[PDB]
């Protein structure tokens, strides 16, 4: 159609490999960054001498 | 050209945690706030 | 060509009645020298100069002078001339100084819709560089948040220069705020913390301040009380606005448009 | 009609590629603009006024703006510029809260 | 139609009061009787609980709409 | 902005400004669109050099406003100081407003033409007569006639 040009298109540089191809009902509350789960238990018991 | 629009986000970064924070507390010590908002100081954190 | 100010404009003036000295010179520029943009004539570049010293000197006096309306007709013609797109020096001796003085005294009008609205004509000297903006600007975001104490910090560390004639302004919209806030459904508040609070160790400010304010005297018992709650929970004033607004539904859902 | 909407955006962008937002808020709210703004300069007229009130700390319609302008803005084409647009978007939406 | 005859025969009772001043009927004393009645049953003041289950039935009804 | 210096009580400083804005009506008219409209102040003001220059800015600024009324009113105000310049892609657009202003009140007056009838202003009157002349003087009839009767005259 009539596209607009004005604005750069910047590059896609994607990752053409498939690497997620998932429809679910993501929310924000999967992305906490944080260093798994079984690391934090682990050092639990060792910071707390038990 | 937005950088402008992004230096002023830094009350928006508080008043989202203090409301998280007032949300999931109920009585917190006010040196308390400042640790978890790294206010950095607990005498302005009573003002904000 | 008619100079008219190189006989004592640099020094100092307490209070002096020099806007004399300044009077017979902005009128002989114009028939002198155009200080409209006018984009004709890029060549010419010497010829402003003159215009932009003759107006850049004008802050100097003006601001020592406590004048509020005069002080804005200034910044007009002045930023101008900053701005012009003719050629000219990239960067005069007061280049942010002036400009900052400007934009400080947006935000002690409590405007701040000119105050962003003013930050783009200047790229990246926001907070990275240019310390003549980063105070005024990051007075901004303090008065944005509650952040007071760093306020008093940054009162005494300015960059241009005392700046005194609008610190004065930034106290009438600190103290009315600071003391809004406060006025929430707390409890007692002894005269310790609220004296020694911000500047003062034992004034008599507070004394008028609880008189044009509130805060019922007592036993050394200060008070803020705040129902809003026998004005609620109603639905007749409700009941006129709900029945206007099914209408609609109805007049909407059955008349052809 | 028909021919000043495209002029419009292009008046409007003059002002934008500029710092020039003082003045250029005087005339969004002064000049109107055409009911038949062939579904296109429409896009572009959203996009500029949202952000005209998005440094102006005019949030609440920045972000109902340029939604609008997203929505109406083509999809199978004009790739680079819905970049722009959501860019702005979510960091107006993010002022907001 | 329901608001337009409730007025009416409210009216026509303001009509009958009309002999406080000027006495037609020496006071019929069943119909003041009704008339205190009437003004007991009207229905308790809006800002009680009543309200809540109010907002809690008109917005039900929003949900279906 | 150069507007800015319209308030120091100085009479010739003032009508400088004014000057310079008509050549600045259009590219940047923005800024003076309603923030200032000081330049009718002055149009009333008994400082007199001024009354019908400031009318030429106070009526090219609300031109493209949209007013008018507003437009046709002051542009008057200037009298052979506006329309002198008969030869324009601006001239037209208010004596279009001129023939279309009085003909909506000729109409209303010929309802009660026998007394009490609106005061007609003399110089919209002339105005388009002036314009009524032009038509003669190009010779073209045809438009001459109907204007006539449009205008009840």
């Not at chain 1, 906490?32 to 639990?44: G, M």
């Given at each position: 159609?009539?596209?607009?040009?004005?604005?750069?298109?910047?590059?896609?540089?994607?990752?053409?490999?498939?690497?997620?191809?998932?429809?679910?009902?993501?929310?924000?509350?999967?992305?906490?960054?944080?260093?798994?789960?079984?690391?934090?238990?682990?050092?639990?018991?060792?910071?707390?001498?038990? | 050209?937005?950088?402008?629009?992004?230096?002023?986000?830094?009350?928006?970064?508080?008043?989202?945690?203090?409301?998280?924070?007032?949300?999931?507390?109920?009585?917190?010590?006010?040196?308390?706030?400042?640790?978890?908002?790294?206010?950095?100081?607990?005498?302005?954190?009573?003002?904000? | 060509?008619?100079?008219?100010?190189?006989?004592?404009?640099?020094?100092?003036?307490?209070?002096?009645?020099?806007?004399?000295?300044?009077?017979?010179?902005?009128?002989?520029?114009?028939?002198?020298?155009?200080?409209?943009?006018?984009?004709?004539?890029?060549?010419?570049?010497?010829?402003?100069?003159?215009?932009?010293?003759?107006?850049?000197?004008?802050?100097?006096?003006?601001?020592?002078?406590?004048?509020?309306?005069?002080?804005?007709?200034?910044?007009?013609?002045?930023?101008?001339?900053?701005?012009?797109?003719?050629?000219?020096?990239?960067?005069?001796?007061?280049?942010?100084?002036?400009?900052?003085?400007?934009?400080?005294?947006?935000?002690?009008?409590?405007?701040?819709?000119?105050?962003?609205?003013?930050?783009?004509?200047?790229?990246?000297?926001?907070?990275?560089?240019?310390?003549?903006?980063?105070?005024?600007?990051?007075?901004?975001?303090?008065?944005?948040?509650?952040?007071?104490?760093?306020?008093?910090?940054?009162?005494?560390?300015?960059?241009?220069?005392?700046?005194?004639?609008?610190?004065?302004?930034?106290?009438?919209?600190?103290?009315?705020?600071?003391?809004?806030?406060?006025?929430?459904?707390?409890?007692?508040?002894?005269?310790?913390?609220?004296?020694?609070?911000?500047?003062?160790?034992?004034?008599?400010?507070?004394?008028?301040?609880?008189?044009?304010?509130?805060?019922?005297?007592?036993?050394?018992?200060?008070?803020?009380?705040?129902?809003?709650?026998?004005?609620?929970?109603?639905?007749?004033?409700?009941?006129?606005?709900?029945?206007?607004?099914?209408?609609?539904?109805?007049?909407?859902?059955?008349?052809?448009? | 009609?028909?021919?000043?909407?495209?002029?419009?955006?292009?008046?409007?962008?003059?002002?934008?590629?500029?710092?020039?937002?003082?003045?250029?808020?005087?005339?969004?709210?002064?000049?109107?603009?055409?009911?038949?703004?062939?579904?296109?300069?429409?896009?572009?007229?959203?996009?500029?006024?949202?952000?005209?009130?998005?440094?102006?700390?005019?949030?609440?319609?920045?972000?109902?703006?340029?939604?609008?302008?997203?929505?109406?803005?083509?999809?199978?084409?004009?790739?680079?510029?819905?970049?722009?647009?959501?860019?702005?978007?979510?960091?107006?939406?993010?002022?907001?809260? | 139609?329901?608001?337009?005859?409730?007025?009416?025969?409210?009216?026509?009772?303001?009509?009958?009061?009309?002999?406080?001043?000027?006495?037609?009927?020496?006071?019929?004393?069943?119909?003041?009787?009704?008339?205190?009645?009437?003004?007991?049953?009207?229905?308790?003041?809006?800002?009680?609980?009543?309200?809540?289950?109010?907002?809690?039935?008109?917005?039900?009804?929003?949900?279906?709409? | 902005?150069?507007?800015?210096?319209?308030?120091?009580?100085?009479?010739?400083?003032?009508?400088?400004?004014?000057?310079?804005?008509?050549?600045?009506?259009?590219?940047?008219?923005?800024?003076?669109?309603?923030?200032?409209?000081?330049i009718e102040?002055?149009y009333?003001?008994?400082?007199?050099?001024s009354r019908q220059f400031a009318a030429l800015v106070a009526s090219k600024?609300?031109?493209?406003?949209?007013?008018?009324?507003?437009?046709?009113n002051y542009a008057l105000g200037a009298g052979?100081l506006f329309?002198?310049?008969?030869?324009?892609?601006?001239?037209?657009?208010?004596?279009?407003?001129?023939?279309?202003?009085?003909?909506?009140?000729?109409?209303?007056?010929?309802?009660?033409?026998?007394?009490?009838?609106?005061?007609?202003?003399?110089?919209?009157?002339?105005?388009?007569?002036?314009?009524?002349?032009?038509?003669?003087?190009?010779?073209?009839?045809?438009?001459?006639?109907?204007?006539?009767?449009?205008?009840?005259?």
């Amino acid at each position: 159609d009539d596209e607009f040009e004005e604005f750069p298109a910047e590059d896609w540089a994607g990752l053409d490999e498939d690497e997620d191809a998932h429809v679910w009902e993501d929310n924000w509350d999967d992305d906490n960054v944080e260093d798994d789960f079984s690391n934090q238990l682990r050092a639990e018991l060792e910071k707390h001498g038990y | 050209g937005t950088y402008t629009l992004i230096i002023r986000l830094r009350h928006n970064v508080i008043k989202t945690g203090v409301r998280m924070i007032s949300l999931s507390y109920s009585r917190i010590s006010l040196a308390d706030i400042a640790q978890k908002l790294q206010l950095d100081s607990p005498e302005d954190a009573e003002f904000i | 060509m008619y100079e008219q100010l190189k006989g004592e404009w640099n020094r100092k003036s307490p209070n002096l009645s020099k806007c004399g000295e300044e009077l017979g010179r902005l009128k002989l520029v114009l028939l002198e020298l155009n200080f409209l943009p006018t984009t004709g004539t890029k060549l010419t570049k010497q010829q402003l100069i003159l215009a932009r010293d003759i107006l850049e000197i004008g802050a100097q006096w003006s601001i020592l002078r406590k004048d509020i309306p005069s002080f804005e007709r200034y910044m007009a013609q002045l930023k101008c001339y900053y701005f012009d797109y003719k050629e000219q020096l990239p960067e005069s001796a007061y280049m942010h100084q002036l400009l900052g003085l400007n934009l400080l005294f947006l935000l002690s009008q409590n405007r701040v819709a000119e105050f962003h609205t003013e930050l783009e004509r200047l790229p990246a000297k926001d907070i990275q560089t240019n310390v003549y903006i980063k105070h005024p600007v990051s007075l901004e975001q303090y008065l944005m948040e509650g952040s007071y104490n760093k306020v008093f910090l940054a009162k005494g560390n300015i960059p241009a220069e005392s700046y005194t004639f609008f610190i004065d302004i930034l106290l009438d919209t600190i103290r009315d705020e600071i003391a809004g806030c406060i006025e929430k459904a707390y409890e007692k508040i002894l005269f310790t913390e609220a004296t020694r609070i911000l500047f003062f160790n034992t004034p008599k400010k507070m004394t008028d301040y609880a008189k044009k304010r509130g805060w019922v005297l007592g036993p050394n018992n200060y008070y803020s009380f705040a129902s809003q709650q026998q004005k609620p929970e109603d639905t007749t004033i409700p009941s006129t606005e709900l029945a206007k607004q099914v209408i609609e539904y109805a007049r909407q859902l059955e008349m052809i448009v | 009609a028909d021919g000043q909407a495209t002029l419009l955006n292009l008046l409007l962008r003059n002002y934008l590629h500029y710092s020039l937002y003082d003045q250029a808020e005087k005339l969004v709210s002064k000049s109107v603009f055409p009911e038949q703004a062939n579904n296109n300069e429409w896009a572009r007229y959203l996009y500029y006024t949202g952000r005209i009130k998005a440094i102006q700390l005019e949030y609440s319609e920045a972000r109902r703006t340029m939604t609008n302008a997203l929505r109406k803005a083509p999809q199978h084409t004009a790739v680079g510029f819905k970049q722009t647009v959501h860019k702005l978007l979510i960091v107006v939406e993010l002022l907001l809260g | 139609h329901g608001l337009k005859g409730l007025n009416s025969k409210l009216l026509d009772i303001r009509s009958y009061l009309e002999k406080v001043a000027t006495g037609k009927l020496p006071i019929n004393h069943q119909i003041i009787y009704q008339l205190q009645d009437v003004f007991n049953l009207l229905p308790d003041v809006s800002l009680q609980e009543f309200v809540k289950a109010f907002y809690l039935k008109t917005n039900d009804q929003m949900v279906v709409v | 902005g150069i507007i800015s210096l319209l308030d120091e009580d100085e009479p010739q400083l003032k009508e400088f400004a004014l000057h310079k804005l008509n050549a600045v009506v259009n590219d940047f008219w923005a800024e003076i669109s309603e923030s200032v409209d000081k330049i009718e102040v002055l149009y009333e003001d008994e400082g007199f050099r001024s009354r019908q220059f400031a009318a030429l800015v106070a009526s090219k600024v609300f031109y493209h406003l949209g007013a008018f009324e507003e437009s046709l009113n002051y542009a008057l105000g200037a009298g052979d100081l506006f329309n002198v310049n008969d030869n324009s892609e601006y001239v037209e657009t208010i004596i279009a407003k001129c023939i279309d202003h009085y003909t909506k009140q000729c109409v209303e007056n010929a309802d009660l033409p026998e007394g009490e009838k609106k005061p007609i202003d003399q110089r919209l009157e002339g105005i388009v007569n002036k314009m009524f002349q032009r038509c003669l003087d190009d010779h073209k009839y045809k438009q001459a006639i109907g204007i006539a009767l449009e205008t009840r005259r």
